Symmetry: C4
Subunit: 223 residues, 4 copies
């Protein structure tokens, strides 16, 4: 069954993306002498991991690797309802296992928050929701524009274009909200570490931005 292979591919792609990207945010200086946070390190690891998984799994399941983008294909009627519920569950379970593996191999002195997205202390959760909405809007718009069959002027690697869209979201919003733009990426480490503060903005935010991006492209710009 091609459907079972697509669900397995989504689960495996999420697991690798979460393990590699959340591992790169580990502060190896520890709580004693924390090292300065390398923003280029985190931004490229997240962005290129997405570009790697889309290259690896694009032709098997579509390479959504995101619950927010999965919801957008339902609002645009590109995938079925039955496919979405299995896609989202696989993404959520892949992040839980991926974060769980990272917690097992990471030394206890450098675990820290295990990459849990948090709103800045001086940032209101209302401002946090807006930041996550926009960064996901630019990501979903890029995916829709990069995968439009009617287009002809599309050049280069589609996966690399999607990855850099993720990278610029991190280069902006790491110190605002953590630059999640992926409900599964935030759900994974939150389950493992039990940090549940302002978690709803990481579901409401990316999903609203995804639906707005998909609807604008499919029904306004290129109908």
């Amino acid at each position: 069954q091609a459907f079972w292979k697509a669900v397995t591919a989504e689960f495996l792609a999420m697991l690798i993306f979460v393990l590699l990207s959340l591992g790169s945010t580990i502060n190896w200086g520890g709580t004693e002498k924390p090292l300065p946070v390398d923003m280029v390190l985190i931004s490229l690891c997240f962005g290129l991991s997405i570009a790697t998984m889309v290259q690896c799994f694009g032709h098997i399941s579509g390479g959504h690797i995101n619950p927010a983008v999965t919801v957008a294909m339902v609002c645009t009627r590109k995938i079925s309802i039955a496919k979405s519920v299995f896609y989202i569950a696989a993404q959520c379970l892949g992040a839980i296992i991926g974060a769980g593996i990272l917690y097992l191999v990471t030394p206890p002195s450098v675990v820290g928050g295990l990459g849990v997205t948090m709103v800045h202390g001086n940032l209101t959760a209302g401002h946090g929701l807006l930041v996550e909405l926009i960064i996901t809007f630019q990501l979903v718009f890029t995916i829709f524009a990069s995968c439009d069959s009617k287009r002809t002027d599309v050049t280069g690697s589609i996966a690399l274009a999607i990855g850099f869209s993720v990278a610029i979201g991190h280069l902006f919003a790491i110190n605002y909200t953590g630059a999640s733009m992926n409900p599964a990426r935030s759900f994974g480490p939150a389950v493992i570490m039990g940090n549940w503060e302002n978690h709803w903005i990481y579901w409401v935010g990316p999903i609203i931005g995804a639906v707005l991006a998909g609807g604008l492209y499919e029904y306004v710009f290129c109908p």
Copy 2:
């Protein structure tokens, strides 16, 4: 009307480019303990944001995302006069809204200059004009060479080539003039923060470099 969709696309592309790129230049250490400025952080965010917006909006409006490059298409008779005045206004308004959104979500202690381009204290404004002229000249030349229909040996992603041209301009001229090469990118935060020092070099500079680049390519090198 396809014209209204092109004007809207230019406004939206500018808004995302300004918000994400100017947000990355925020010094989160504040005025108390400023952190060292990460030049790779700013350069890639600006460059890849342009590569993202050209990928997103190239087939809708042409993806100018710059008043300077818009003027070049008029001098080369690639766009009409009526299209340019609506393009420039949309770019200017998109940067104002994009910078205004950033000012709303940025904590007051880390706002700083809000990404306003400034000439170096030891740099004469005459030297500042020359620096901006050249970095815009290499950007417009790349765009013209990447979008030449008569060429055959063009390979790879056109948007990624345009983005790296922006990135190398930042890797050079951040500490000279701020590496603007975009009159709208400088006009936006200047309106919000009311910093208007040496603002004319960010219009005269990029425009002269753009016109020189477009004329040299279209009428001297590849007529």
Copy 3:
């Protein structure tokens, strides 16, 4: 003979990859005042070196540049047994010469460990084996997915996709195990410097991950 040219190409590609990548990990601050380790420096040098050698030598020998990936083509029956033993020996000898050249030109005060992969002090060798297994699994899967003739939706540079897969492995596992994912890359400097601690995990790890990746792609996902 085309076979002799392929063996020579593998030897030369490994030599350049080892010399350039291991040179970038040299801490020029020395043992007196060590400089902070630049992770982006090491990650991109390793990743782009692979993308450079695949571009240079892909059409001559296939551009394996890795004993682990060479074993995967045998388990998938893409290369012959006789070709593999000559490929692995050339890779091992290329890394020894490449590391030997680096040791000759590097000043004695900054030689340090000469890029020998080591397990973290707080990391158990069992955890070290798991980390190396996964990072090689994502690398071999990318290579197999990027070089599948049956695929049609493959876009962009194949070599650049393979390089970024290496880069994200380094951005994750430099402080865990050294992010080897290449038995030859670890065998080379180990011979020169005589550091042989936990060396078996750099052969058992990458090979098991390579075989699992090749078998899953060729016999489960895309049979």
Copy 4:
């Protein structure tokens, strides 16, 4: 005349490459409080500048942008003797003007060495020659392999492949010899600043590596 346009293109491409890349190496901390040298900053600026100029000027003059690579096309009989002497002179004059412009706009307190390549104090000039030879060998081999008409499996941007080859040379050899791999890039600032120490290794080194790379590819690997 197409010949005059090719010579002008080589002069202009060299001028932009030298000005932007040498500007990025300026230590803005000055001699009072020097800032730590950002290696990723210098490596990407040099590499992406080459990728930008090849994209800009590849179809006009071939985009050599290097005296060493120009000599390789003569040894391989890809260009004529008369074309080479005009190409090399344009490259040398472009670097002199490009470095001269940079010296004019750079504040006197941060000029420093103006990007002059120097051998490390603990490095023997004999070791310096070897380092420059190899990094140019991998650059010329990439150019020859990326521009082989007989090849079919070439994918992605050719200019981006050439740029990353330059970038990995810098990520290795900045602290060894300065990572010149371009006789013009070293000749330019040397004339302006009058620093002439071990200058011969920056001509003998890159040229020997270029000739070895071109001969091996054209007459041994792919005859």
